[PDB]
Symmetry: C3
Subunit: 648 residues, 3 copies
Amino acid sequence: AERISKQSTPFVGAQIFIEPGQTQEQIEQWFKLLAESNMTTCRIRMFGKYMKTPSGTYDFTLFDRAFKLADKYHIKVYATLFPDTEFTDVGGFKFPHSREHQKEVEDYIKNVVSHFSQYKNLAAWVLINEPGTPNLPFNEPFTKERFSDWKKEHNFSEYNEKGYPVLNFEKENFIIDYHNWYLNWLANQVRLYDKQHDLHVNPHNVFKLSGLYDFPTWRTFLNSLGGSAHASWHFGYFPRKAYTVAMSANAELIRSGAGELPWLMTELQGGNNLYSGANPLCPTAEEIIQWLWINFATEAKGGIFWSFNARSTAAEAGEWAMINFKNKSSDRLIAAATIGKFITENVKMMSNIKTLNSGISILYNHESMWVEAAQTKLNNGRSIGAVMCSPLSYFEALSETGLQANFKEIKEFDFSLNDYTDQVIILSHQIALDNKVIKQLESFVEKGGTLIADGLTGYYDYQAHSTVVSGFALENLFGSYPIEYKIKENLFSLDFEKDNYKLPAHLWKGTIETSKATPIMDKEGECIACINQYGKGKVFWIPSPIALGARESKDFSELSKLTVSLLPNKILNDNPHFDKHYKDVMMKSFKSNGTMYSLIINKSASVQTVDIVGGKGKAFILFANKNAHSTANKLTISPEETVIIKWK
Amino acid sequence: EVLFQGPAERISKQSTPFVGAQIFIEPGQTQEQIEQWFKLLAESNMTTCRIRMFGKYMKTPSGTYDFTLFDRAFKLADKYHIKVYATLFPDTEFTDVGGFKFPHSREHQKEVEDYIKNVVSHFSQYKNLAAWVLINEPGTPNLPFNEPFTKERFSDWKKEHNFSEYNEKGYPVLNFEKENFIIDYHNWYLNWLANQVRLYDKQHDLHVNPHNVFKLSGLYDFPTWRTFLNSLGGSAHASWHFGYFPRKAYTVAMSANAELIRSGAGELPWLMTELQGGNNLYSGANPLCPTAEEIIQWLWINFATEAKGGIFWSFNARSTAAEAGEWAMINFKNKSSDRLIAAATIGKFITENVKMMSNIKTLNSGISILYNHESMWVEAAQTRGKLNNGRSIGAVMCSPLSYFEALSETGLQANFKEIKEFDFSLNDYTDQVIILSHQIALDNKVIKQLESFVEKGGTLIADGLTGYYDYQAHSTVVSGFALENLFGSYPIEYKIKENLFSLDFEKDNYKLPAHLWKGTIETSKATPIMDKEGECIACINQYGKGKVFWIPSPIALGARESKDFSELSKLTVSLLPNKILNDNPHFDKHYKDVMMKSFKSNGTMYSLIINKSASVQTVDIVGGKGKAFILFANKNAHSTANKLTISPEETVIIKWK
Amino acid sequence: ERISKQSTPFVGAQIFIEPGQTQEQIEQWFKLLAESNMTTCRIRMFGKYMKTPSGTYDFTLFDRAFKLADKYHIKVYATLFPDTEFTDVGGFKFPHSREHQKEVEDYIKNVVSHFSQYKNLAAWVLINEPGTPNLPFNEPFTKERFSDWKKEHNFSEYNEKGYPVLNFEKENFIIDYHNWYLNWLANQVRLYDKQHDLHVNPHNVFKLSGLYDFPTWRTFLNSLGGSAHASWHFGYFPRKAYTVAMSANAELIRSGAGELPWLMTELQGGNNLYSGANPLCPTAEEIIQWLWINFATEAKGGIFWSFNARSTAAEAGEWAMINFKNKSSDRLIAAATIGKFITENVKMMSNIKTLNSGISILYNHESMWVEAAQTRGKLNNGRSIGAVMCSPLSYFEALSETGLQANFKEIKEFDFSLNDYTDQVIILSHQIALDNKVIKQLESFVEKGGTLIADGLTGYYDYQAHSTVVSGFALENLFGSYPIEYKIKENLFSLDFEKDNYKLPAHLWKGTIETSKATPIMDKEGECIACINQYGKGKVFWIPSPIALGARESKDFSELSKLTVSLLPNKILNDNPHFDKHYKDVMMKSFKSNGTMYSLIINKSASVQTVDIVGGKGKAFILFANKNAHSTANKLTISPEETVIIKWK
Ligand SMILES: *[C@H]1O[C@H](CO)[C@@H](O)[C@H](O)[C@@H]1F
Ligand SMILES: *[C@H]1O[C@H](CO)[C@@H](O)[C@H](O)[C@@H]1F
Ligand SMILES: *[C@H]1O[C@H](CO)[C@@H](O)[C@H](O)[C@@H]1F
Ligand SMILES: [Cl-]
Ligand SMILES: [Cl-]
Ligand SMILES: [Cl-]
């Protein structure tokens, strides 16, 4: 069996939804049209409920029929392990209920994997669909016992080294280790019966659930990392006109989690919300093309849509499907097919995509989210999600300048190199940093790194103890000390001395006293920011939330201008970007075998002319779904259009 | 039925209608206050009261019953020739405003048995007793599945009912065990109360007042209730039950609430047991003090819809805690508010026109707006309990209510019926119309009935997600569309849009407001209708002698969300059989915030007209026969030919000569 | 020294002591506190930070703080605060169990025996922020105490006349349980220390006043405290009226205190980051406003929470008057100007007495209890919890914008036993519950010359939620009239009087009446909406529409001000300094010290205002002004956010 690699040819595919009641004729209609739509791959939920007989023995007939029809039309299968559960459980249970239930799951895996491993068209086991839940069942006897056990193996003091009170976040650290444990245990159960096939898993709702996910530990037992990125469930932090930015960030976040492993998007929205979804929609054809290009330009090795055909009963009946109710192509499948086709006509290019790293990394950490949950309310600086919305705003501001940026958990960043010249780290409202990471940040800047920090970055440590109160742990690196935070309106202006910038800011104004660092003053004569030279590199610190400020004002233009002014000149010379900020336009570049490309998407209401500067060579338009044209390096791109430029 | 009836009134479809009010009896009241109430009730041309027979105010420490407090009230009613609707109301907490809806326990069921034995044995002996109300406001949004009696009755119910997790074809299903149990449990307890009363009194009418009917209709099997009731009641409180409407459309609300009870009643007569008589202070969801104009509107709408009475809550007020000095028609000196003076003008009109008011029959246009329990049950499962709109609880009722409103503003009667209350057994349905507006659940059995109805000449109008699911929440739209035969077409996609969008038709530049979802179809036998974008959005199928119009976008919820039913009125009129518009009086065109409904009495035709607009309106009435003569008008309306000039808030009855 | 109504007032602040802090940091705090003209601190005596594994007490951490306070001549309010979870910010309000009650006995014995020995100890705070909306009826100690309470109290389900009743067992138990536990704490302290003042700080008083029997508390306290935090307690007001809020909060505690002196134990000293319901950072201008409003209302001190901040979790680096380098914020520099003014005017500031206009705005527990039962717990407005307090607070605001003092009292804190009430005024604004006993006291008050103003649903119910309006109006005698109807209307409507003199905003309900002895007042629509009754030497004005809630909802108190002034005895307007007319967002309140009269004026508007002060005697001289106010004759020109003290010569 073919193992996936960073050189595999990317695929477009879709969920094939198998339940009892379906006829051989309907199932074949689906696989035939899937193959005709230039799709290579399906995913199939291996429902234990539809394989278990009254007596307890397994009947594989319903799924044999589907696997055999996939094989006939040369379609390879991602098979999701999905034990018996309530019919009304849409997404599946995330952990065993009990020791008795764990044994039902052991028996389920033995039966399913032993049988279905024999099909030559099996491409992967999905160990579990959508691992992680906001609310873990601490009520249930299995989780209660595993948390009790976990606490006895971990010693915690109620005070720190200096004698101050601390929080230890026993619950949050247990939850990380419990996810690590059960996914590793599922991988091991599969490996008892099949060592030949790729192990995959699709983390979801990542801008809220990232605090459950230790992606570096997962790399030890996975072959590839998946994701669900549903416009209707996961992008609540954005308007629809910025789902481009949402999909870009979601992709960057999984890519970072994947590390040395290849990644793909296991779940994209293929169809209409009727009664389902939190932010319901029907993706436009234009949106299908945007989502596929953003994923592939971000190194994705596939895009699987949920779903090809629809469920028939209760939750989500006749929703999410790419085919209409006569089993023919919606404009969404016609659009997905144009991308399948582009791939088979440009195999060498699409098989070898590497993101063009600007060298900008936007870092988030679990501990900032844990501390925020303890200090806060659901809306905003004083609510759950500011610690993610803040980095997402820098991310958006850089997208509207046409620059790539990574989006990583801080443990996924490599702090071991000897040189970080022309590398940039943005810590936007990462309210919790400990001594160990401050040393890594000290090392990074010393060796040439640029560090940009805003909002309440470093206010607390990993124990929710504030060094701002006891003795500021970042005084050395920042070359300055915080004085006050004063709360203001939801939205206020930081007006810099000599009219250099008027910056939107959210909720709190910070004042500092500089020691080694160069002060920056506002028109009111207060010190609001500084630049510290620290070894070969530099630090820009502005302890007002200017990122949440741009988000709340719905204008990222001033955050874009400031951030560009702080970037090493090498980033702007070597990477294609926009001559200035463009509201609701995105660009992201990539390489394949030494050739550079640029993805451009216009999400504005009007035709835009973007001046692309930096990079090398003449823009040739390789892909454009609404007849964009270029004069020199000025691209004229229509609303909702996706453009790939090949630089010659 | 006549030896068993003896001297007691059997109410009938020929009974003389009454106006009446709740007389609120609690300890502390004096003989002088109680008499003041009954005296003024009689002087206000009211013939009837209702009295909550509080077990709490009759039970003694020892357990024996003391009837003194209620004897005093019944005797004073009899003195002023006032007949009593007596509500069975066992002992409960003082703070329990509406009363418990089911027994708590087997022990509690026996307290209720003993309560009924004592109260009915005693009070059946008064000659002025007109009716037993078996229970006040049967049904609750939230049933007590916690309590041991309900838990045991649901357990028992499930053991007597076998359900498969799959249908005939092999597909997964929901069975709605909870919802079907709740129907059968209401049927059971009301029937059991009726049987307890019948052990001791076979002479008097059994009555019950279902409430909040636009939300609670999925608890109510009215056809089964007919087996043990003599009349069907209702509560229709402007402050509790009309949340789906603004105040200026409480006319439409009261009209639909009346049509809904009338349909439930079938061969039984009905009356409105509970109307709002007075002011909300701290109580009510949408608080108000009814205007005099509103009291007259509500009474005429009910009588014109075959009601045999209107009982106001309340004549006098409660004195302590919940609703103290609220709801009363008398002021705090025990004299007439403008609300009682208004109610009295209607009592008087009745006693001066007895033959006419005793024989009212609604003039059926032949238009029937049908709802079903199962559409409400499936909606509750799909929306998972959101509360605002297509994607929330109540779209399945608001959609039919929009058609109903649009027909009211055209001056046409329409029935409002649960699908099981419609008669599908006739051989001819020429010039009959069925509207299925967003009835999202239809099974095979009912599709056959609809096929039969259209075949034999019926017109079927369907919009929104009608027929998307079956009674098991399985969607035939996905597996094989069960309505393909009747509609002569198949659905293609639903695409969600804004809260409010426009359906722009290919021809005549013509525009429908629509809510939430755009539906597209492929026609086989039916004639397609296309939009400007070249997609098929509606069709007309000729099926036997009758026709089907299908438009799977919600155009009814579309009119409701846009607060304009003018285009829904014009479209619906254009689909109607010509016979309906020739034989029934209606408006020459749509009139915003005006309502008309016609009725007959012994071969003479009448029309009720109410202006809820801000300005004097001149309505041209066409259809029917003869000269409009103004029989009733509370603000000096005049008519030149068939053009009525009617003032804001005015109620007019026209007699056709 | 024991506190008295002649004690010199102090400015002070919480000193927050927890493990981890160094001797050098603690000293920096006390040194700067002394340099900021502050004489006093409060210290939470955390049981958690004194208990050893073995169970014995180690006093080291607090010895260090007490000794450093003594070095800088700073006296200590010591809050009893037994062992509790680190995450419990405000502390438990009652013992969890009989076993827990014994841990608290042992805690008090150890802490009081030890710390009573320091010469700089000024007071024991028996418990921080007594009172909780929701009591732990779950927990075995409270369950047993409520069971016991019910067995000692017999209630009938009916009244004397035979009518059903509510008895409010829960609400009356809660009063008696607060009385009991605070008295029990006072007695435990007195086993070991009879030499030091006992203090307690009630909080969120506009919501929690129904938990507080202040007259009973006087029996065992030496002084009454209060928390009045802008970020937690002033939800019924916008920020531009926190002046009015602090004024009413002060009047409410002063009234509770009676013959006892009072002080504000907890004021907001600093910034909300993640904490607070209505978050802010007090301006320097706001610090000065709050201190002057409290002292002008007889406060003997203002203690800010906090001098220095907590370091971990809840409120870490929040609330502090010092910045993160341990130097003065503009808030501490402002507080210091007031400490300094005191030490330079000791005779004046030591003897402040409020100048009683004679206007008393009365609220009662029972109106709040009945409202909670009738609204069934809606939270927005006449049909929601808080109307019974918002209504009196609106009269209070309207009188503030006229420059008149008013008392704000629970009805049991008003003295009904005098023989003369000439030129005294009582306002009952939407006090929906009055019993026969209090109606007799009101009858007596008016007979003997009192003016009674009543609006909204005053007297609609009795203390058992029985409505005499329905059964036989208990206020017919005093009002000389009977209610006819209440009709619900819009949120906001206009009562337009027959005479073209008053158009009054009104909320929710229109009341109509029939007059017998009283003189009717008609509206343009011909309905009787109000009356004046002459009753003995005094008068009653009744208008049963809510005109106070009406002003609040319309954000205009100008018409309520003009009407109320027109009803006042001439003597109040001649003897008390007030404004020539209503001024939106300006407040004045006068006070005396040893026969000299003063006036506090605060401008909360966006612009310079010129207020004509009339009434009183003599020449306005500016004694205090933080933004160069001037007066020409009796016309004060006062800048936005400015606080002015006038000395009348
Ligand atoms: C991902 O999301 C889709 C859309 O709700 C689900 O149907 C699948 O179960 C999976 F959970
Ligand atoms: C109908 O509604 C009235 C008015 O609220 C209630 O008071 C009665 O109990 C009856 F339920
Ligand atoms: C008064 O207020 C402060 C601020 O929230 C609290 O920290 C203290 O515990 C006291 F409750
Ligand atoms: Cl799956
Ligand atoms: Cl009743
Ligand atoms: Cl304290």
